[PDB]
Motif scaffolding. Structure first.
Motif, PDB file in Angstrom:
ATOM      1  N   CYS C  88       4.538   6.257   7.267  1.00 53.12           N
ATOM      2  CA  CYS C  88       3.361   5.764   7.963  1.00 53.12           C
ATOM      3  C   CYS C  88       3.756   4.554   8.819  1.00 53.12           C
ATOM      4  CB  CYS C  88       2.245   5.426   6.970  1.00 53.12           C
ATOM      5  SG  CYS C  88       2.820   4.849   5.367  1.00 53.12           S
ATOM      6  N   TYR C  89       4.373   3.547   8.196  1.00 45.73           N
ATOM      7  CA  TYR C  89       4.879   2.395   8.922  1.00 45.73           C
ATOM      8  C   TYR C  89       6.246   2.712   9.475  1.00 45.73           C
ATOM      9  CZ  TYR C  89       4.894  -2.421  10.244  1.00 45.73           C
ATOM     10  OH  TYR C  89       4.848  -3.589  10.964  1.00 45.73           O
ATOM     11  N   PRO C  90       6.363   2.734  10.811  1.00 44.61           N
ATOM     12  CA  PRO C  90       7.489   3.248  11.599  1.00 44.61           C
ATOM     13  C   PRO C  90       8.807   2.704  11.129  1.00 44.61           C
ATOM     14  CG  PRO C  90       5.771   2.582  13.044  1.00 44.61           C
ATOM     15  CD  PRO C  90       5.338   2.144  11.675  1.00 44.61           C
ATOM     16  N   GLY C 127       0.883  -7.841   1.378  1.00 48.53           N
ATOM     17  CA  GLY C 127       1.006  -7.451   2.769  1.00 48.53           C
ATOM     18  C   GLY C 127       0.597  -5.996   2.875  1.00 48.53           C
ATOM     19  N   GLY C 128       0.096  -5.595   4.037  1.00 49.65           N
ATOM     20  CA  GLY C 128      -0.246  -4.197   4.256  1.00 49.65           C
ATOM     21  C   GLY C 128      -0.500  -3.854   5.713  1.00 49.65           C
ATOM     22  N   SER C 129      -0.762  -2.588   6.007  1.00 46.19           N
ATOM     23  CA  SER C 129      -0.936  -2.223   7.398  1.00 46.19           C
ATOM     24  C   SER C 129      -1.884  -1.076   7.592  1.00 46.19           C
ATOM     25  CB  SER C 129       0.404  -1.862   8.009  1.00 46.19           C
ATOM     26  OG  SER C 129       0.236  -1.564   9.382  1.00 46.19           O
ATOM     27  N   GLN C 130      -2.378  -0.912   8.817  1.00 44.56           N
ATOM     28  CA  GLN C 130      -3.219   0.216   9.169  1.00 44.56           C
ATOM     29  C   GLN C 130      -2.286   1.297   9.663  1.00 44.56           C
ATOM     30  OE1 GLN C 130      -6.932  -1.124  11.104  1.00 44.56           O
ATOM     31  NE2 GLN C 130      -7.921   0.171   9.508  1.00 44.56           N
ATOM     32  N   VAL C 175      13.465  -3.449   4.774  1.00 41.10           N
ATOM     33  CA  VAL C 175      13.682  -4.652   5.599  1.00 41.10           C
ATOM     34  C   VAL C 175      12.910  -4.612   6.937  1.00 41.10           C
ATOM     35  CG1 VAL C 175      15.399  -5.470   7.253  1.00 41.10           C
ATOM     36  CG2 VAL C 175      15.886  -5.478   4.779  1.00 41.10           C
ATOM     37  N   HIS C 176      11.975  -5.539   7.133  1.00 46.53           N
ATOM     38  CA  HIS C 176      11.033  -5.513   8.270  1.00 46.53           C
ATOM     39  C   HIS C 176      11.540  -6.139   9.584  1.00 46.53           C
ATOM     40  CE1 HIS C 176       7.396  -5.330  10.454  1.00 46.53           C
ATOM     41  NE2 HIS C 176       7.043  -6.593  10.312  1.00 46.53           N
ATOM     42  N   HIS C 177      11.338  -5.430  10.693  1.00 40.03           N
ATOM     43  CA  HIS C 177      11.851  -5.895  11.991  1.00 40.03           C
ATOM     44  C   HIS C 177      10.753  -6.281  12.947  1.00 40.03           C
ATOM     45  CE1 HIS C 177      16.111  -4.181  11.493  1.00 40.03           C
ATOM     46  NE2 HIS C 177      15.518  -4.270  10.316  1.00 40.03           N
ATOM     47  N   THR C 182       8.134 -15.006  16.860  1.00 38.34           N
ATOM     48  CA  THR C 182       6.960 -15.720  16.370  1.00 38.34           C
ATOM     49  C   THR C 182       6.141 -14.961  15.293  1.00 38.34           C
ATOM     50  OG1 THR C 182       4.736 -16.355  17.172  1.00 38.34           O
ATOM     51  CG2 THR C 182       6.222 -15.280  18.764  1.00 38.34           C
ATOM     52  N   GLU C 183       5.987 -13.639  15.446  1.00 43.90           N
ATOM     53  CA  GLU C 183       5.465 -12.771  14.378  1.00 43.90           C
ATOM     54  C   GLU C 183       6.330 -12.930  13.127  1.00 43.90           C
ATOM     55  OE1 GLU C 183       4.646  -8.184  14.984  1.00 43.90           O
ATOM     56  OE2 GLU C 183       6.177  -8.337  13.395  1.00 43.90           O
ATOM     57  N   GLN C 184       7.600 -13.236  13.369  1.00 48.08           N
ATOM     58  CA  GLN C 184       8.599 -13.428  12.325  1.00 48.08           C
ATOM     59  C   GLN C 184       8.308 -14.689  11.528  1.00 48.08           C
ATOM     60  OE1 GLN C 184      11.151 -12.466  10.667  1.00 48.08           O
ATOM     61  NE2 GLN C 184      12.360 -14.311  10.188  1.00 48.08           N
ATOM     62  N   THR C 186       5.354 -16.226  11.808  1.00 50.15           N
ATOM     63  CA  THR C 186       4.019 -15.935  11.302  1.00 50.15           C
ATOM     64  C   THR C 186       4.083 -15.313   9.898  1.00 50.15           C
ATOM     65  OG1 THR C 186       2.818 -15.761  13.403  1.00 50.15           O
ATOM     66  CG2 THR C 186       2.039 -14.406  11.574  1.00 50.15           C
ATOM     67  N   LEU C 187       4.836 -14.219   9.746  1.00 45.59           N
ATOM     68  CA  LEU C 187       4.935 -13.509   8.471  1.00 45.59           C
ATOM     69  C   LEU C 187       5.832 -14.179   7.428  1.00 45.59           C
ATOM     70  CD1 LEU C 187       5.695  -9.919   9.877  1.00 45.59           C
ATOM     71  CD2 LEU C 187       3.422 -10.661   9.062  1.00 45.59           C
ATOM     72  N   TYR C 188       6.976 -14.707   7.859  1.00 41.43           N
ATOM     73  CA  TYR C 188       8.002 -15.114   6.902  1.00 41.43           C
ATOM     74  C   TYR C 188       8.374 -16.577   7.035  1.00 41.43           C
ATOM     75  CZ  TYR C 188       8.274 -10.021   7.229  1.00 41.43           C
ATOM     76  OH  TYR C 188       7.974  -8.690   7.368  1.00 41.43           O
ATOM     77  N   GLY C 218       0.616   2.895  16.621  1.00 42.97           N
ATOM     78  CA  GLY C 218       0.106   1.638  17.112  1.00 42.97           C
ATOM     79  C   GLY C 218       0.885   0.463  16.570  1.00 42.97           C
ATOM     80  N   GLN C 219       1.992   0.742  15.898  1.00 46.07           N
ATOM     81  CA  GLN C 219       2.768  -0.325  15.295  1.00 46.07           C
ATOM     82  C   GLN C 219       4.005  -0.651  16.100  1.00 46.07           C
ATOM     83  OE1 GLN C 219       2.322  -2.474  13.209  1.00 46.07           O
ATOM     84  NE2 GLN C 219       0.496  -1.804  12.073  1.00 46.07           N
ATOM     85  N   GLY C 220       4.188  -1.929  16.385  1.00 51.16           N
ATOM     86  CA  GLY C 220       5.397  -2.364  17.053  1.00 51.16           C
ATOM     87  C   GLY C 220       6.550  -2.626  16.092  1.00 51.16           C
TER      88      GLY C 220
HETATM   89  C1  LIG Z   1       1.905  -8.001   6.162  1.00 46.97           C
HETATM   90  C2  LIG Z   1       1.170  -8.199   7.470  1.00 46.97           C
HETATM   91  O1  LIG Z   1       1.051  -9.344   7.936  1.00 46.97           O
HETATM   92  N1  LIG Z   1       0.688  -7.085   8.031  1.00 46.97           N
HETATM   93  C3  LIG Z   1      -0.052  -7.055   9.282  1.00 46.97           C
HETATM   94  C4  LIG Z   1       0.680  -6.223  10.296  1.00 46.97           C
HETATM   95  C5  LIG Z   1       2.024  -6.842  10.584  1.00 46.97           C
HETATM   96  O2  LIG Z   1       1.821  -8.211  10.894  1.00 46.97           O
HETATM   97  C6  LIG Z   1       2.739  -6.185  11.771  1.00 46.97           C
HETATM   98  O3  LIG Z   1       2.665  -4.771  11.724  1.00 46.97           O
HETATM   99  C7  LIG Z   1       4.204  -6.583  11.767  1.00 46.97           C
HETATM  100  O4  LIG Z   1       4.909  -5.644  12.546  1.00 46.97           O
HETATM  101  O5  LIG Z   1      -0.038  -6.112  11.530  1.00 46.97           O
HETATM  102  C8  LIG Z   1      -1.376  -5.612  11.451  1.00 46.97           C
HETATM  103  O6  LIG Z   1      -1.963  -5.654  12.727  1.00 46.97           O
HETATM  104  C9  LIG Z   1      -1.445  -4.154  10.964  1.00 46.97           C
HETATM  105  O7  LIG Z   1      -0.470  -3.582  10.422  1.00 46.97           O
HETATM  106  O8  LIG Z   1      -2.535  -3.569  11.106  1.00 46.97           O
HETATM  107  C10 LIG Z   1      -2.151  -6.457  10.438  1.00 46.97           C
HETATM  108  C11 LIG Z   1      -1.430  -6.443   9.090  1.00 46.97           C
HETATM  109  O9  LIG Z   1      -2.177  -7.134   8.083  1.00 46.97           O
END
Ligand SMILES: CC(=O)N[C@H]1[C@H]([C@H](O)[C@H](O)CO)O[C@@](O)(C(=O)O)C[C@@H]1O
Ligand SMILES: CC(=O)N[C@H]1[C@H]([C@H](O)[C@H](O)CO)O[C@@](OC[C@H]2O[C@@H](O)[C@H](O)[C@@H](O)[C@H]2O)(C(=O)O)C[C@@H]1O
Lengths: 486, 486, 486
Positions: C88-90, C127-130, C175-177, C182-184, C186-188, C218-220
């Motif tokens: 699901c997550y690319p 953490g999670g994703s759509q 391992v997440h890329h 900045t998202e980097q 942001t998350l970590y 829709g995932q980068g």
């Molecule tokens: C753990 C986390 O922060 N997940 C978030 C992700 C990630 O930030 C990016 O996918 C990184 O590539 O982005 C979202 O838009 C998504 O998946 O819907 C919100 C989601 O809560």
């Protein structure tokens, strides 16, 4: 005059397509089934005995592998399945198999000092470990040099070698991966150290990868070894701000073929063979053996069959397609023993059996070429059957197995039938040689005699030991004994 | 009336299982042994001549490869064994073989500008080198663009392309590895630069790996090239804070098969063939050739044998299994030359030889299907035999060699015996056709004539040229000429 | 007395190397062509049923693969061609195909909480994703934890499991890329994250490989997964200063052998085969077949031939090499139907056909062993034919194809000829059994009767139903009926 075929005291069985365990006058085994039992030289050239050492242990110089004798030239390598003595200090070896394959065969292989141990004056070159314990003090791979910080300074380490040795050279180097950030500093002072190797073809920069690992030989560290071939007149340049395990020695090479590594637990005892087997040496000429697949040498297309016996003689009936043998000529003559086919006359003078050597030759001549073609036409080259694959090469390893099996099923089938057919044909060949003789006679005599139908002819006249001899002679005389009836 | 078989002025030899160099009335060569001598189109489609260039040199645009003509569609590629003109600037090419293989065949292949050279306004795009010298000034791969710092600023380099071209696209990029820390700054300003490429499937970030290396083309630097296929409607995004050697062009692809790369030193001269060979083209229909293994096209199962000749006719005895030929019928009739088997009558009216065309046909009919089956049943597909392996793919390369040899030994044996057997069988077939005719007569005549035993019958009565013709006719009349003892 | 042969209103046409189409009495089949359509079981065991889930969707816990029946054993694995739900997550999965083949056959397979998710106290475990939506909230592979920062800190993450399960346990981490620096953070919250995994045999660091790439779901971002297999009383270890995606569960894995993966869109149907197909379950004992090449298990060989018609009875022409059949004995007897060869007497008492069961048996006996040898000698092992290759394994995949084709062309040719030959030989065998009977009679009778030459003998005396029965009896009496000449 009676037509008939050789019979004898033979107990040998052949199989045909229509019938099994058929007894025949004479057969021939084309399948070698027995081996020397010992591991020996291959074309005079000995192997490289590794005992309980591994190729990595050997070339790195694990102190447990000190006691090795390395004839600069070997034909094959004997390595245990799971040697005890590998990398004494834990770690990994990169492209290990590709290296094992590369150093399959050498001619020759000689070690040379390329970066003398004591020429690292700005660094400490004495670090060992319990992993590589000698007597039993901290020690290290005899062929490698562990650079550590001097006092508290790890200056740029620089070394280089120009391959003026005349033959390509195998060179190995290491990168140590410590347990934690502090072990890193303790040893090489500065973090973010690097090891950079360089040749005309090689380019690589390594940074120590650190992680908390379990203890292997009481060590948490890891040494990751890599290797390259240094082409002639090319130079290799090492440069490290810490973490490098530089080589002290290089290895002059010199290939000329591609042998293999035999995995056994044995120990050569000086014999010979054009063909060696993990189970023993083979001494033979037959198109097939069934001893072991992973042979090294020039080997009889190893087949998966219990036996392969060619019929050369005819069906042995005691007392076919052409009616003669075990047919209208009810049985064979224990009495005749100078050929396969012959006559037996009741004359004014006793007698007596006499083989027709002429037609017995054309048979011995032919059947020989059949046996030989079956053999002499088999193609045979030099080949090592068994190769090595890493744990992450399962698929590749399987592809190779299925390939070996594939050719095994083919060479088995092929040989197994070539025996069935060709026995059914060897036999009917004899049967046709007999019924062909029965006609070489009948067609000379004609009505000059009666055809008893048991193979025998009864003369409608007198036939001295000079007339008999004339029928076999192939030259009768119907226009004479003609006028002489009842 | 005499039973006998054709003989003639034939000198052709066949081999059988029981006997070699047997002379036969007529044979047939199934092994093609001769080649065109020139390299030619393959199904009309020409190859790609690379001359002394390499695939890397071509695609990167080494200035020495400028003079190339690239028909957007080729059938095979002709590459020298060791081209002079590869990477003019030293370095490496990643997954080079996998790329060589991929671009085996194309249909078509067209270059498009994807990241125009002059659109890098914030960076210097003019850097060349002696390595790639032109006339002879510092130059560079025509298809690549060397980004360097502008003034003294290497801003974030960003480029991207959306594959709206309609077909998958091959795209290549580079990463330069400088000699020292300063060359790094001199060129791209900031150390710790990176190159990051991205597609839907690709994700990679590279950091320059630096090391002191020898000079190759007077260069210590290295350019490591990598490649990807850009799927349709997918986009590729480059981003670099220095060290990137971006592409200017991409390559529209379009496969439909899987050809190969032929390694020769020749130069096509416009001919044709369903089959090309590193040594020359093959024009044939026979189940086998022995010219060269690494063929490209639809090829006669290449076998390792010097000759393969099938017996079609019978043993040629001038002047067997069934007794007739070179047996009780001592020899053949130079005289008879309208068939293989026939009669020869001494009548009130001269005569005279006459072949029994009916039985000579059933033989010509059958023996034809034997020759054809041996041929027409051979399976033949399109295949390129030779592939490429890297220096660290020795094992893989060997696995592939042992596989080719494996099938070579099989197809050789198989064909070599199918000739032996089947000759031993073609011959005994004729011998059986004769002794079968000798009986078609004898069994018509019976006691109306005497059986001389030399193949001839002597009539116990009169047989005009209408009675003779009746025996051959297959319709005699024993219930007539009966009255005349025987 | 007439010595013709059997027959019947049959239009079964067999094939020989001389004759195309040969209407014959009895023929056999050797090329099994029929199968259930049931995907069954191998030697008793079920496949792993996968559905529109891929093997990684599964193990990772893609939350579309909940809808699943996972079973502690499998002889193979059914997987869709292009599964729907995988990642699901690319991302990417390192050494994917080298893993599939590993778990293609197991015994057993057990998932165990090895690294409870809570006890990550210092980090976020939600953490999670759509990319991975369940109902449809943000979510994620339900076997993985996306460790992210808690508060503004990302404390060093440290995980440890000393395998106490007693079974080897395949453990998978990721391992997440991130899309960019900045998202980097942001998350970590810190670039220069590294993910370190180490065991007794595996050591790996890895750093975020940020690139600007397109959207997949829709995932980068991308997640890259990599596995290993932690041995008994070993212990894998984690350390990451960001970016780790950790297992929550390892798997107990107990193997004993190989197997493949079957790319089909069916469902196992509770049953049994010993050899499966993407199009059904083959059950037979014939040596060949032509359902599907991509077999899993003990199957007959796969040859590319349409029809394998053998031969089990003389040629047909009711009213050869040996003259009898369709020869001097012009035709066959619809009348005789208790054997293949027999007599037909015109006596003082009607009559009448009678097959010579003795010689009809020796024929039925022999021809049986021919059919059986052709079959029973075929070698058959367990094997999965289809394997998997990555996009950068084109050459390897092609090497494997050319290898399968290679053996296919061989087994086809071989079988295709073994039928041609052997039919030409089965037929001439019957023809020889007849003309052999014609002589078992003629040679008993001699001049006591006349030889009509149509197969029939006319008695020069009287032969009651006890004399007739004596000729067939094999015991005549020429020294009696001798008196009654003409
Ligand atoms: C753990 C986390 O922060 N997940 C978030 C992700 C990630 O930030 C990016 O996918 C990184 O590539 O982005 C979202 O838009 C998504 O998946 O819907 C919100 C989601 O809560
Ligand atoms: C874009 C650019 O800078 N091109 C340079 C090139 C590269 O910087 C270099 O090749 C990378 O290794 O350097 C060139 O000159 C190299 C030159 O360096 C001097 O220090 C030395 O005196 C010379 O012996 C030689 O090594 C080159 O042509 O390669 C110039 C080029 O424009």
């Amino acid at each position: 005059i009676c037509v008939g075929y050789h019979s004898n005291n033979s107990t040998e069985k052949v199989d045909t397509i229509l019938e099994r365990n058929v007894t025949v006058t004479h057969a021939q085994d084309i399948l070698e089934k027995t081996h020397n039992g010992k591991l020996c030289k291959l074309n005079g050239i000995p192997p490289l005995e590794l005992g309980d050492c591994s190729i990595a242990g050997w070339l790195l110089g694990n102190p447990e592998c000190d006691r090795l004798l390395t004839v600069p030239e070997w034909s094959y390598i004997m390595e245990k399945e799971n040697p005890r003595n590998g990398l004494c200090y834990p770690g990994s070896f990169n492209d290990y198999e590709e290296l094992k394959h590369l150093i399959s065969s050498v001619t020759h292989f000689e070690k040379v000092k390329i970066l003398p141990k004591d020429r690292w004056t700005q660094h400490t070159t004495t670090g060992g470990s319990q992993g590589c314990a000698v007597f039993d003090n901290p020690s290290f791979f005899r062929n490698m040099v562990w650079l550590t910080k001097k006092g508290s300074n790890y200056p740029v380490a620089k070394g280089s070698y120009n391959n003026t040795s005349g033959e390509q050279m195998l060179i190995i180097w290491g990168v140590h991966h410590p347990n934690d950030e502090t072990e890193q500093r303790t040893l090489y002072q500065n973090v973010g150290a690097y090891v950079s190797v360089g040749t005309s073809t090689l380019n690589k920069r390594s940074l120590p990868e650190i992680a908390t690992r379990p203890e292997v030989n009481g060590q948490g560290g890891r040494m990751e070894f890599s290797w390259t071939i240094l082409d002639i007149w090319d130079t290799i340049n090492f440069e490290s701000t810490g973490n490098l395990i530089a080589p002290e020695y290089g290895f002059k090479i010199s290939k000329r073929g591609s042998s293999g590594i035999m995995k056994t637990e044995g120990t050569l005892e000086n014999c010979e063979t054009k063909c060696q087997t993990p189970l023993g040496a083979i001494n033979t000429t037959l198109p097939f053996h069934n001893i072991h697949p992973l042979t090294i040498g020039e080997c009889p297309k190893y087949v998966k069959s219990e036996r392969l016996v060619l019929a050369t003689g005819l069906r042995n009936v005691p007392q076919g397609l052409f009616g003669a043998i075990a047919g209208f000529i009810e049985g064979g003559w224990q009495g005749m023993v100078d050929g396969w086919y012959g006559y037996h006359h009741s004359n004014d003078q006793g007698s007596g059996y006499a083989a027709d050597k002429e037609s017995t030759q054309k048979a011995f001549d032919g059947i020989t070429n059949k046996v030989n073609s079956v053999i002499e036409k088999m193609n045979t080259q030099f080949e090592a059957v068994g190769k090595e694959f890493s744990n992450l090469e399962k698929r590749l390893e399987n592809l190779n197995k299925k390939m070996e099996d594939g050719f095994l099923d083919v060479w088995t089938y092929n040989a197994e039938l070539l025996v069935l057919m060709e026995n059914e044909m060897t036999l009917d060949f004899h049967d046709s040689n007999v019924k062909n003789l029965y006609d070489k006679v009948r067609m000379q005599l004609r009505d000059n005699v009666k055809e008893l139908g048991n193979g025998c002819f009864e003369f409608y006249h007198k036939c001295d030991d000079e007339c008999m001899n004339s029928v076999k002679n192939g030259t009768y005389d119907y226009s004479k004994y003609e006028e002489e009836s009842k």
